Design a protein around this ligand. Structure first.
Ligand SMILES: Nc1nc2c(ncn2[C@@H]2O[C@H](COP(=O)(O)OP(=O)(O)OP(=O)(O)O)[C@@H](O)[C@H]2O)c(=O)[nH]1
Ligand SMILES: Nc1ncnc2c1ncn2[C@@H]1O[C@H](COP(=O)(O)OP(=O)(O)CP(=O)(O)O)[C@@H](O)[C@H]1O
Ligand SMILES: Nc1nc2c(ncn2[C@@H]2O[C@H](COP(=O)(O)OP(=O)(O)O)[C@@H](O)[C@H]2O)c(=O)[nH]1
Ligand SMILES: CC(=O)N1CCC(NCCc2ccccc2)CC1
Ligand SMILES: [Ca+2]
Ligand SMILES: [Ca+2]
Ligand SMILES: [Ca+2]
Ligand SMILES: [Mg+2]
Ligand SMILES: [Mg+2]
Ligand SMILES: [Mg+2]
Lengths: 54, 423, 341, 438
């Protein structure tokens, strides 16, 4: 039960009490995922428009 | 500004659509001439969802009336709220469809469809953000069934990413105009399976039994049946027409109601239905809402299981008590709800009750018990088709038996699909 | 109409409890995977406590106390007693025990040998017993047997002077069932059972563990003196009066009630559900030893105990009354003894 | 002085952001028009509140915040609300149609078409920062925008501000105040792609906030306003050290240092007390020990779980009000002897304490009562993994049948990302059990 690093200022204070000691994707890769998903949608909608034209 | 374009096709579609606009127009404070004379701002809050705003603070429904004969739409334009519809939005022919799906879909309907799309295109272009389309129609006739699905397939080509909802009246021999209704209904169901996001199945037999047994009406009429459809159409669209949270728009309702694309056929339910001054408690609204007698598809929910449910309570009530009774129904019948979709029963509250009711409840169910509705149609269909009876009405319009076999096969698959998820 | 689920098909105790529930016409059983349940008769291992108490409008209950394993594990019980100031290392009703990990894996090997050596020099009885069974007086045999295995073991003193029944000169042990409800009332079933050894106790041969281990399976002279080597409190009480001139309540029952209170009241802050989003109850089986001085010792604690065949009805009916209906009431002369605290 | 930019995404993010900035102004004495009579350095300054408020020559204090929603109805409230004058139009961004509770729709379909814009608006606020520390992102797990677009934003922020920290305040889904059935899907999808991009994430379970409002405030049917006023109180406690003079958690980096010894285990549990009803006749003011003891009651945690059955990696006590260090230690020593606080062996058994003398502020007319002293505890327990377990269970129930999966595939997402995200959760749950189980 020890207190350490007691800091005090006009607006408050902080301290630490110890009881016991111890024992990414690039901008390119992102723009690819996005366009891939946009392409799979374009393919799905093209198959629908092809189905409707038939 | 999430607008919806409404379409009503055929005799049944326009007679029910007329009553629908008569009901909500009253709820939103719009008189037969399109002038607003309400007292609450909640009415106008989401008024642009169904109504356009013309010069002079006028509100004109965003509705398109379609038919192949002038008889029915002439009555609408001469009816109560006849003057409210945009005069240009009446599109009709003189030939008729003779209760023939082929005529509505391939011959007579093909001649008139292009001029209907010119009106749809006009209404959509004026929409700041078009949600989608809703269509009221019967499946047993010729125009609403045959041309109705033709409009859906053609509108889909032009607005493929919007939402398509239908209120579809299913035929029953107990309330029959012609023997060919099963043919038309089966041909349409195939279309709806592929082209709509949501279809509210309104079985004329359920409506009949409710009028005869529950409402104690000795001789039900189409007028009496259309009253129940009005009350239900008003209830199921309350989520869209007033300031709310869940199922606020068409795509969001679909996301929470449709777990599998082909299984988008709902059983609507309404409460109360009195044969009338007594107050209805919250427990009573809930027991009646889920009771089969109050359901309008004529499918006993105790025969299947609910994939998802959307409940709506209208009026000034205890939202705390609403949550209690809802949880009570689910917990007291958890064997009729699939256990592999957590929290699949959603409830919404609205403070504006329907005309003449202190409070009410509208029920939207996606139950596998709807499969029995398609079983009736399939049995009635094959009874005539195995003898090729009455096919000449259709083959004489350019169709082929193969097209009938295909529609039949797709509906049987739909049934088998419901069956596997019921287990 | 309350709902419950069954997740332990092998629980004879709750198989009967579930039978009685359905017999009341007010409890409906659901599929074992249905979450809209009021009561859960859960599995033994890996019971998913983290999913309880998160169903709106549902008061959920379960037949196990999360954390109770600290009391129902050979190694965990030893560590709990030694480290809990409530029980302390000087606990008088618990045999001197030690946690010994096999050499193929803290550990208490050296601490165990310090006491063992002290006895070997003090001419005192140095007969120990390891388990997780081998009884031996040489520490070399005990430690060498745990190494041949690959799981944690515990070496505790063997009661060389156990109380022997007559006629027969035979060992025994006592089983008490203890139900702790959602409020943490400690109820002790008025009916215990003594699992006796049908073989005369022989202190000069620990190789034949038939007269030393009183388990109903090992024994099963079976059924000679009493049916199924099982003696109940009525006969055992009359025996203590005829032989020793004392009652079961005075000579033994006071100590058992003390031991049960101490153990449960100690881990109460760790397992209580008084402020939890779900509620817990659990049935316990305490096993005791009695020596020729009428002093009671704590053998172990069982977290999923079975019940004596003759008492399944009465006790199971009791589990429903004070543990299940106390939370979900239905529309005496209690069989339990409340250990107040 | 180092600046902090707040980003509010989706309805839950925006509305909660409205509650916090309302409270921030009431605390720092900033009126709805942006004026601050106490700021004697007009048009500038390097004070503590400047980390959250920019300054114009006219003396207005503008929040360093950006609001993003794919549907314009929730942010239109801000544009015409009480604090409409606080923000300039550049800070409020809105689209036409939302993500419809569809993670794929918010991440791919709609997100791809508005991601470069939001970044350009953030870049505008960054340019006003002379020493930007990082970002605080508010969003829901269940919403299509809060989940889908947030994770896309988090990736871009890591690319455009790789050296800056990022903190999340995430709303965990609760069926009692939710109607979307697919929120388990979105929750786990957003956690997978956002995990490697977040430094410290505070989860708020709506079920916890809901029960606190009914139990402590006597709100039979709480509304989002009730929930958000309470949530912003906890957020104020957590962000107070960045906005006021002090020495504990002085910058966003310190949050990771003090609360996250293991990078993948960066979800601290928050506990707050006391929550007293303003409608209460009058409450007896609780002491340091009673409110500190209350921090170990599950009933005031932001996420229901049982810390008694996990292990602590870090514990941080943040007091506001009449609190002296002497009383804090007197309460801690009282709780160690009663509570079951097991720490991981590789972490020291200890508590970092921060005390701010100004007591909590309460929005006039709100639901909370003025209290003399309040504490918020930030503890890193392995017990919070219970919330992932619950969420994972619901995911598996639906994915086994592929229920609703077609909505995501229809927005261009591949089905594989489901199991990819789920496997990452199975990995997250394995790290938690390696830390707090023997
Ligand atoms: N605490 C709190 N939770 C909210 C709030 N608003 C929504 N939620 C929760 O957030 C979840 C829904 O996500 P939203 O934020 O509404 O969705 P979104 O980010 O706007 O994305 P969209 O799907 O495009 O509308 C539900 O679980 C709600 O309970 C709020 O104001 N406060
Ligand atoms: N310290 C000790 N001294 C003497 N005998 C002991 C002893 N510990 C256990 N025994 C004997 O072993 C039996 C208890 O064994 P234990 O309970 O450890 O095995 P077990 O758990 O498989 C049976 P249960 O769990 O059902 O009681 C008692 O009947 C007793 O005779
Ligand atoms: N509920 C209801 N059903 C109707 C109404 N009119 C017709 N029907 C049903 O619809 C089918 C006839 O379709 P109909 O609308 O006349 O065909 P259409 O004019 O070619 O579109 C039959 O099954 C009738 O039972 C009505 O007003 N209400
Ligand atoms: C999943 C599923 O059932 N689908 C069928 C419904 C489809 N959306 C509606 C298409 C539309 C749009 C405008 C007019 C008419 C039709 C999506 C796929
Ligand atoms: Ca012609
Ligand atoms: Ca300044
Ligand atoms: Ca990073
Ligand atoms: Mg007709
Ligand atoms: Mg045992
Ligand atoms: Mg939204």
């Amino acid at each position: 039960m020890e207190v350490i690093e007691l800091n005090k200022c006009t607006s408050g204070q902080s301290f630490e009490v110890i009881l016991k000691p111890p024992s990414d994707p690039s901008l390119e890769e992102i723009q690819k995922k996005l366009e891939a998903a946009e392409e799979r949608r374009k393919y799905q909608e093209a198959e629908l428009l092809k189905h409707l034209a038939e | 500004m999430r607008e919806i374009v409404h379409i009503q096709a055929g005799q049944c579609g326009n007679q029910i659509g007329a009553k629908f606009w008569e009901v909500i127009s009253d709820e939103h404070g719009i008189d037969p001439t399109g002038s607003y004379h309400g007292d609450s701002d909640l009415q106008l809050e989401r008024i642009n969802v169904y109504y356009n705003e013309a010069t002079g603070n006028k509100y004109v429904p965003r509705a398109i009336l379609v038919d192949l004969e002038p008889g029915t739409m002439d009555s609408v334009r001469s009816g109560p709220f006849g003057q409210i519809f945009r005069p240009d939005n009446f599109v009709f022919g003189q030939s008729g469809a003779g209760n023939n799906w082929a005529k509505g879909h391939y011959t007579e309907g093909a001649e008139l469809v292009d001029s209907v799309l010119d009106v749809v295109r006009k209404e959509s272009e004026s929409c700041d953000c078009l949600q989608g389309f809703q269509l009221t129609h019967s499946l047993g006739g010729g125009t609403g069934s045959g041309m109705g699905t033709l409009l859906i397939s053609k509108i889909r080509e032009e607005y493929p990413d919007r939402i398509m909802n239908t209120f579809s009246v299913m035929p029953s021999p107990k309330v029959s105009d012609t023997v060919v209704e099963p043919y038309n209904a089966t041909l349409s169901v195939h279309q709806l399976v592929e082209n709509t996001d949501e279809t509210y199945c309104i079985d004329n037999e359920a409506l009949y039994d409710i009028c005869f047994r529950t409402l104690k009406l000795t001789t039900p009429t189409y007028g009496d049946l259309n009253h129940l459809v009005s009350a239900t159409m008003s209830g199921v669209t309350t989520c869209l027409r007033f300031p709310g949270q869940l199922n606020a728009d068409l795509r969001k309702l679909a996301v929470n109601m449709v777990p599998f694309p082909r299984l988008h056929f709902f059983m609507p339910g309404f409460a109360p239905l009195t044969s009338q001054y007594r107050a209805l408690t919250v427990p009573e609204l809930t027991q009646q809402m889920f009771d089969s007698k109050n359901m309008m598809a004529a499918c006993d929910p105790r025969h299947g299981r609910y994939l998802t449910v959307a409940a709506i309570f209208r009026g000034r009530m205890s939202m705390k008590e609403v949550d209690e009774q809802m949880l009570n129904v689910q917990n007291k019948n958890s064997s009729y709800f699939v256990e592999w979709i957590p929290n699949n029963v959603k409830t919404a509250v609205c403070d504006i009750p329907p005309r003449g009711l202190k409070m009410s409840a509208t029920f939207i169910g996606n139950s596998t018990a709807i499969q029995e509705l398609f079983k009736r149609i399939s049995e009635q269909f094959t009874a005539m088709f195995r003898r090729k009876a009455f096919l000449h009405w259709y083959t004489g319009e350019g169709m082929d038996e193969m097209e009938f076999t295909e529609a039949e096969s797709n509906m049987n698959d739909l049934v088998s699909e419901y069956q596997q998820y019921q287990d | 109409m309350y709902t419950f689920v069954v997740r332990d098909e092998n629980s004879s105790v709750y198989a009967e409890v579930s039978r009685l529930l359905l017999a009341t016409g007010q409890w409906k059983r659901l599929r074992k995977d249905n979450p809209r349940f009021n009561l859960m008769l859960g599995e033994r291992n890996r019971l998913p406590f983290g999913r309880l108490g998160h169903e709106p409008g549902l008061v959920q209950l379960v037949n196990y106390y999360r954390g109770a394993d600290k009391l129902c594990r050979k190694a965990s019980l030893v560590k709990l007693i030694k480290t809990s100031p409530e029980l302390s290392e000087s606990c008088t009703w618990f045999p001197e025990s030690y946690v010994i990990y096999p050499t193929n894996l803290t550990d208490e090997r050296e601490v165990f040998l310090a006491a063992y050596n002290r006895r070997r020099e003090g001419r005192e009885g140095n007969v120990w017993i390891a388990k997780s069974i081998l009884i031996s007086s040489e520490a070399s045999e005990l430690l060498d047997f745990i190494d041949e295995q690959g799981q944690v073991h515990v070496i505790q003193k063997y009661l060389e002077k156990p109380l022997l029944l007559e006629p027969g000169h035979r060992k025994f042990d006592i089983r008490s069932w203890v139900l702790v409800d959602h409020l943490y009332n400690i109820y002790l079933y008025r009916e215990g059972v003594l699992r006796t050894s049908s073989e005369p106790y022989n202190s000069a041969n620990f190789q034949d563990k038939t007269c030393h281990l009183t388990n109903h399976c090992i024994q099963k002279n079976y059924g000679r003196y009493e049916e199924g080597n099982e003696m109940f409190f009525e006969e055992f009480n009359q025996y203590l009066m005829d032989a020793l001139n004392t009652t079961l309540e005075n000579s033994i029952l006071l100590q058992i009630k003390h031991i049960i209170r101490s153990c449960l009241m100690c881990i109460e802050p760790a397992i209580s559900t008084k402020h939890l989003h779900y509620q817990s109850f659990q049935l316990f089986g305490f096993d005791f030893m009695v020596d020729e001085e009428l002093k009671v010792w704590l053998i172990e604690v069982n977290g999923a105990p079975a019940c004596a065949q003759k008492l399944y009805a009465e006790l199971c009916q009791g589990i429903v009354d004070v543990a299940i209906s106390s939370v979900f009431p239905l529309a005496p002369t209690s069989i339990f003894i409340k250990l107040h605290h | 002085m180092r600046e902090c930019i707040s980003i509010h995404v989706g309805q839950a993010g925006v509305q909660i952001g409205n509650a916090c900035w309302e409270l921030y102004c009431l605390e720092h004495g900033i009126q709805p028009d942006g004026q601050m009579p106490s700021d004697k350095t007009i048009g500038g300054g390097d004070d503590s509140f400047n980390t959250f408020f920019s300054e114009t020559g006219a003396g207005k204090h503008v929040p360093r915040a950006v609001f993003v929603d794919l549907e314009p109805t929730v942010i239109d409230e801000v544009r015409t609300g009480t604090y409409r004058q606080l923000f300039h139009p550049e800070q409020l961004i809105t689209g036409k149609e939302d993500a419809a509770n569809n993670y794929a729709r918010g991440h791919y379909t709609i997100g791809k078409e508005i991601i470069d814009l939001v970044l350009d608006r953030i870049r505008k606020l960054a340019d006003q920062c002379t020493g930007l520390q990082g970002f605080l992102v508010f969003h829901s797990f269940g919403g299509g925008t809060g989940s889908g677009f947030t994770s896309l934003l988090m990736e871009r922020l890591s690319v455009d501000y790789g050296k800056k920290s990022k903190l999340e305040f995430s709303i965990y889904p609760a069926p009692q105040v939710s109607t979307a059935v697919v929120e388990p899907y979105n929750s786990i999808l957003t956690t997978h792609t956002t995990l490697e991009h977040s430094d410290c994430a505070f989860m708020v379970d709506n079920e916890a906030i809901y029960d606190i409002c009914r139990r402590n405030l006597d709100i039979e049917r709480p509304t989002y306003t009730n929930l958000n006023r309470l949530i912003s109180q906890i957020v104020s406690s957590i962000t107070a050290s960045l906005r006021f003079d002090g020495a504990l958690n002085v910058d966003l980096t310190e949050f990771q240092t003090n609360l996250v010894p293991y990078p993948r285990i960066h979800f601290p549990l928050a506990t707050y007390a006391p929550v007293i009803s303003a409608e209460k006749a009058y409450h007896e003011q609780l002491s340091v020990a009673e409110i500190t003891n209350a921090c170990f009651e599950p009933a005031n945690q932001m996420v229901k779980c049982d810390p008694r059955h996990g292990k602590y990696m870090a514990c941080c006590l943040l007091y506001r009000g009449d609190v002296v260090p002497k009383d804090v230690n007197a309460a801690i020593a009282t709780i160690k002897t009663k509570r079951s606080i097991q720490f991981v062996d590789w972490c020291p058994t200890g508590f970092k304490v921060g005390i701010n003398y100004q007591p909590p502020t309460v929005v006039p007319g709100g639901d909370l009562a003025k209290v003399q002293r309040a504490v918020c505890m930030l503890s890193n327990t392995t017990a919070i993994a219970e919330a992932w377990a619950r969420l994972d269970h619901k995911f598996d129930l639906m994915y086994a049948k592929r229920a609703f999966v077609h909505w995501y595939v229809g927005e261009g997402m591949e089905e594989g990302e489901f199991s990819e995200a789920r496997e990452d959760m199975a990995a997250l749950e394995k790290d938690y059990e390696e830390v707090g189980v023997d």
